[PDB]
Amino acid sequence: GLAVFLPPYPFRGLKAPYLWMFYKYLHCATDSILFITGEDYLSVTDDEAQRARWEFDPASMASLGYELPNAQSMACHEYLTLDNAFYETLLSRHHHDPIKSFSAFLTERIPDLETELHALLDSKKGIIDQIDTFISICNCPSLEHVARTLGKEVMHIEIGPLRAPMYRNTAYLDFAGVNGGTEASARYEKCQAEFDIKASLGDLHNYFLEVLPPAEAATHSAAGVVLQVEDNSNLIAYNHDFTNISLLSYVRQRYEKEDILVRAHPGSLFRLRDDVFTIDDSANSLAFINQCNEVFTINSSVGLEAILTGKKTTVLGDCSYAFINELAGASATVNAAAFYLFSYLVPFDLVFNQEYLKFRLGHPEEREIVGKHIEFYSAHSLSSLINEAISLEH
Amino acid sequence: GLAVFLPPYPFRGLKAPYLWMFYKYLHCATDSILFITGEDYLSVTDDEAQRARWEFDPASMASLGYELPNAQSMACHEYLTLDNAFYETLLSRHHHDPIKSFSAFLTERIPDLETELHALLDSKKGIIDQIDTFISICNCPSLEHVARTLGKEVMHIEIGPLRAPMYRNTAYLDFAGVNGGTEASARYEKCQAEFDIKASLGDLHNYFLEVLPPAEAATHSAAGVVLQVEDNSNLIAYNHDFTNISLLSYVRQRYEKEDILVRAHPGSLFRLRDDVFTIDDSANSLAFINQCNEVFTINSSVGLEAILTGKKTTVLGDCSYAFINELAGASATVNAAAFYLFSYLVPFDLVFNQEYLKFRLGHPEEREIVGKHIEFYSAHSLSSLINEAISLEH
Numbered sequence: 001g002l003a004v005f006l007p008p009y010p011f012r013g014l015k016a017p018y019l020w021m022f023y024k025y026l027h028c029a030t031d032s033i034l035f036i037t038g039e040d041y042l043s044v045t046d047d048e049a050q051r052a053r054w055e056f057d058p059a060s061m062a063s064l065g066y067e068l069p070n071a072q073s074m075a076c077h078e079y080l081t082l083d084n085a086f087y088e089t090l091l092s093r094h095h096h097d098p099i100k101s102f103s104a105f106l107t108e109r110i111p112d113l114e115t116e117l118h119a120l121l122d123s124k125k126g127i128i129d130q131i132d133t134f135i136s137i138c139n140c141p142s143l144e145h146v147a148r149t150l151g152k153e154v155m156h157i158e159i160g161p162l163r164a165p166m167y168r169n170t171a172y173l174d175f176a177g178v179n180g181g182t183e184a185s186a187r188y189e190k191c192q193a194e195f196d197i198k199a200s201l202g203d204l205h206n207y208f209l210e211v212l213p214p215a216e217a218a219t220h221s222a223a224g225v226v227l228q229v230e231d232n233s234n235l236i237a238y239n240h241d242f243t244n245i246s247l248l249s250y251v252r253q254r255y256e257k258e259d260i261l262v263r264a265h266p267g268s269l270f271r272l273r274d275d276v277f278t279i280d281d282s283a284n285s286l287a288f289i290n291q292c293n294e295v296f297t298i299n300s301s302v303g304l305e306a307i308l309t310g311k312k313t314t315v316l317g318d319c320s321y322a323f324i325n326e327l328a329g330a331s332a333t334v335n336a337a338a339f340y341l342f343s344y345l346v347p348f349d350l351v352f353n354q355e356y357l358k359f360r361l362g363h364p365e366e367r368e369i370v371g372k373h374i375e376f377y378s379a380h381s382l383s384s385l386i387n388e389a390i391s392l393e394h
Numbered sequence: 395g396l397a398v399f400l401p402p403y404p405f406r407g408l409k410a411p412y413l414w415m416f417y418k419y420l421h422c423a424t425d426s427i428l429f430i431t432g433e434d435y436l437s438v439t440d441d442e443a444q445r446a447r448w449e450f451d452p453a454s455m456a457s458l459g460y461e462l463p464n465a466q467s468m469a470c471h472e473y474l475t476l477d478n479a480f481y482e483t484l485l486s487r488h489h490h491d492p493i494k495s496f497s498a499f500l501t502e503r504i505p506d507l508e509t510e511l512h513a514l515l516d517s518k519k520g521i522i523d524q525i526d527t528f529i530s531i532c533n534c535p536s537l538e539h540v541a542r543t544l545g546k547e548v549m550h551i552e553i554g555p556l557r558a559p560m561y562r563n564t565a566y567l568d569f570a571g572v573n574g575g576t577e578a579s580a581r582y583e584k585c586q587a588e589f590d591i592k593a594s595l596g597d598l599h600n601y602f603l604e605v606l607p608p609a610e611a612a613t614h615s616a617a618g619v620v621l622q623v624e625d626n627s628n629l630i631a632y633n634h635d636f637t638n639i640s641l642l643s644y645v646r647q648r649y650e651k652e653d654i655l656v657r658a659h660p661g662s663l664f665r666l667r668d669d670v671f672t673i674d675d676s677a678n679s680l681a682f683i684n685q686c687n688e689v690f691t692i693n694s695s696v697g698l699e700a701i702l703t704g705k706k707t708t709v710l711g712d713c714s715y716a717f718i719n720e721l722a723g724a725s726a727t728v729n730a731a732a733f734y735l736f737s738y739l740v741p742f743d744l745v746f747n748q749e750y751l752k753f754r755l756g757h758p759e760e761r762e763i764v765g766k767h768i769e770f771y772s773a774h775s776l777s778s779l780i781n782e783a784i785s786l787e788h
């Protein structure tokens with residue numbers, strides 16, 4: 001079966017922080033799977049002092065394609081629960097800074113964590129052997145080390161950078177790292193010679209757009225700045241020490257403040273005062289981007305959007321799509337982006353689909369991977385698969 | 395004379411960033427002083443695309459006690475100007491992050507900076523010998539190293555944590571460090587035995603309050619969180635890696651979100667969304683504090699305010715006043731705070747007064763220092779000086 005790691009540790013101050021993926025796996029489940037999680041994920045469903053959370057909102061539920069589990073839905077599966085005192089103990093080893101503790105959880109081994117994991121995984125006999133792969137929603141070297149000892153692979157799975165309703169839903173699936181430490185550039189390097197895509201970057205973008213585009217390229221700001229959620233894993237671990245405020249100061253070295261348009265992240269706790277910069281108020285990030293000559297970001301999904309619409313983009317942090325931007329030729333960039341969208345990214349629902357997971361677990365050729373994504377999307381060389389997908393969809 | 399260091403480097407994206415202190419020294423000047431600064435501080439006065447800055451606002455001018463210089467006012471003094479390409483070069487040595495470059499400027503030696511300083515300081519003969527002390531508005535180990543080579547002391551001078559109109563204006567003056575690396579705790583340790591202050595912490599606070607207090611201790615939040623300006627020197631260098639967002643997550647480990655009251659810094663670029671926490675909207679930080687049972691801060695001036703009003707205070711960064719909070723007994727805390735307010739802090743105008751600077755340059759006894767501050771404030775042992783000041787002022 002699948003071993004799904006949904007750590008309960010409330011680093012950002014929220015209990016059961018990955019509850020939406022717990023509900024998505026639980027909704028889509030054909031076989032039993034092993035949850036490695038925390039008591040919180042199980043009791044939130046009945047605790048009334050938190051039904052104002054967004055994972056219980058029918059608009060988020062419909063958008064991610066899940067319904068709330070019931071007693072029978074829970075009982076198909078096995079559960080292993082981590083405890084809190086390791087969390088308390090972890091905080092005190094990092095000066096009671098929960099954000100530094102999160103950083104450590106994302107980027108270093110924690111021996112106590114590993115022992116707890118090793119203990120739960122043979123808490124009952126037969127558990128270990130039934131495990132076909134681990135799935136983790138974030139990088140976790142404690143788990144990756146545990147997985148090596150046992151001979152298990154680790155699929156790192158997260159919602160993608162293109163999302164409904166603006167786009168088809170996409171998801172990440174990467175054996176090395178999600179967001180940080182990814183293998184997207186190395187997968188492309190192995191197959192770049194098979195890519196001869198007869199489309200522009202804009203045509204790639206249109207294939208994935210599910211809406212009429214805004215499209216008012218008239219009136220502009222020389223520079224657009226993308227802000228991110230301040231304590232997102234991207235901004236804690238893979239940011240190269242850039243923050244929202246040093247990103248703005250980066251931009252202000254280069255442009256006067258009258259030439260800068262700044263878009264706060266809708267999900268951030270913080271908004272911009274209407275004092276110094278021109279604050280964007282577009283209904284969506286695509287219409288924000290189309291108002292800017294160039295775009296500056298740490299590692300937000302919106303940077304990919306800026307690259308697919310042809311904009312000069314500066315990417316200051318590590319991310320899965322950076323390598324696309326770093327290519328020289330215009331054609332080289334198109335081919336790298338097409339591999340990215342059609343083969344690195346996965347149609348969102350497949351990463352919760354157990355047979356597609358078995359497929360990826362056999363490490364098939366890039367042609368097979370691209371042919372299975374396009375089949376899902378549309379419901380013979382690799383280049384002609386994509387070229388025709390583009391040509392027919394249009 | 396005085397050698398005043400007002401670095402022109404626009405780390406926070408603002409030219410002539412320390413312009414208000416340049417205008418305060420220029421207004422108060424009796425003798426010629428040597429400015430070590432940048433071309434920007436001189437041309438801003440005539441550049442019309444920046445008279446919207448707050449240093450030209452008659453309300454800031456009246457509050458800090460200065461008027462704008464004229465041609466004659468400038469001509470009393472000598473000027474030495476730093477150049478920009480060292481700044482450009484510094485940025486590229488820190489991944490073009492201006493906030494990391496600022497951190498380095500505040501906490502490490504920069505050899506190129508030192509050579510530039512050494513060059514300007516004997517650009518003309520006789521400059522060096524006329525220098526009686528350097529004054530710097532922030533810590534700068536390049537300058538401190540330069541000062542040691544030449545045999546000069548460095549006064550670190552900044553606006554204090556108590557400010558008009560809520561309080562008498564105060565200023566910092568410290569030979570080792572301002573904000574970071576201060577000597578306040580070590581000055582107190584040398585004289586603690588001379589301190590027997592017959593007053594409460596509240597009476598200390600009242601001596602400095604210049605307004606009727608708000609005073610509505612009825613209705614409360616278990617926890618108040620103080621946010622700071624995100625790219626302030628305090629939050630770049632002396633913060634122990636705490637940020638506004640990890641401070642909130644620190645508080646959320648300890649209290650539910652319904653028990654937390656959060657005050658953004660009025661000067662920050664960012665305000666809080668009205669979604670998750672109760673956002674304070676008091677007219678001033680004192681009325682915010684009086685609504686909270688305990689107060690959490692990195693190293694904001696408001697933490698001192700919380701300590702003078704008797705509140706349980708948590709201080710997560712380095713600051714000049716921390717040592718007061720770390721004391722055990724109630725009496726011990728009063729005495730440490732009285733030394734802090736009456737002898738560590740300086741009445742704001744004296745730190746621009748050239749004869750008072752000569753006084754401090756002779757390193758007089760704490761009794762002399764306290765007697766000169768109280769004389770300024772009111773216009774014989776150390777304990778009876780303060781006890782009577784408190785008793786008469788009331």
Ligand SMILES: Nc1ccn([C@@H]2O[C@H](COP(=O)(O)O[C@@]3(C(=O)O)C[C@@H](O)[C@@H](O)[C@@H]([C@H](O)CO)O3)[C@@H](O)[C@H]2O)c(=O)n1
Binds near residue numbers: 159162232265
């Ligand atoms: N200034 C911004 C930033 C984002 N968005 C919108 O918010 C979405 C997410 O972009 P993000 O910038 O990539 O958001 C974060 C981030 O802040 O870095 C937080 C959260 O989405 C989380 O999903 C992580 C990664 O998905 C972690 O795996 O990424 C975009 O696709 C876009 O719809 C926006 O409109 N404006």
Ligand SMILES: Nc1ccn([C@@H]2O[C@H](COP(=O)(O)O[C@@]3(C(=O)O)C[C@@H](O)[C@@H](O)[C@@H]([C@H](O)CO)O3)[C@@H](O)[C@H]2O)c(=O)n1
Binds near residue numbers: 553620694
């Ligand atoms: N949440 C806050 C923070 C501050 N203040 C008010 O703003 C003032 C400054 O407090 P600060 O928190 O100490 O402000 C900063 C800071 O953000 O740390 C920025 C700026 O004042 C600068 O003066 C530095 C030091 O003065 C640097 O020497 O300190 C307080 O005295 C108080 O009037 C407030 O009302 N609410």
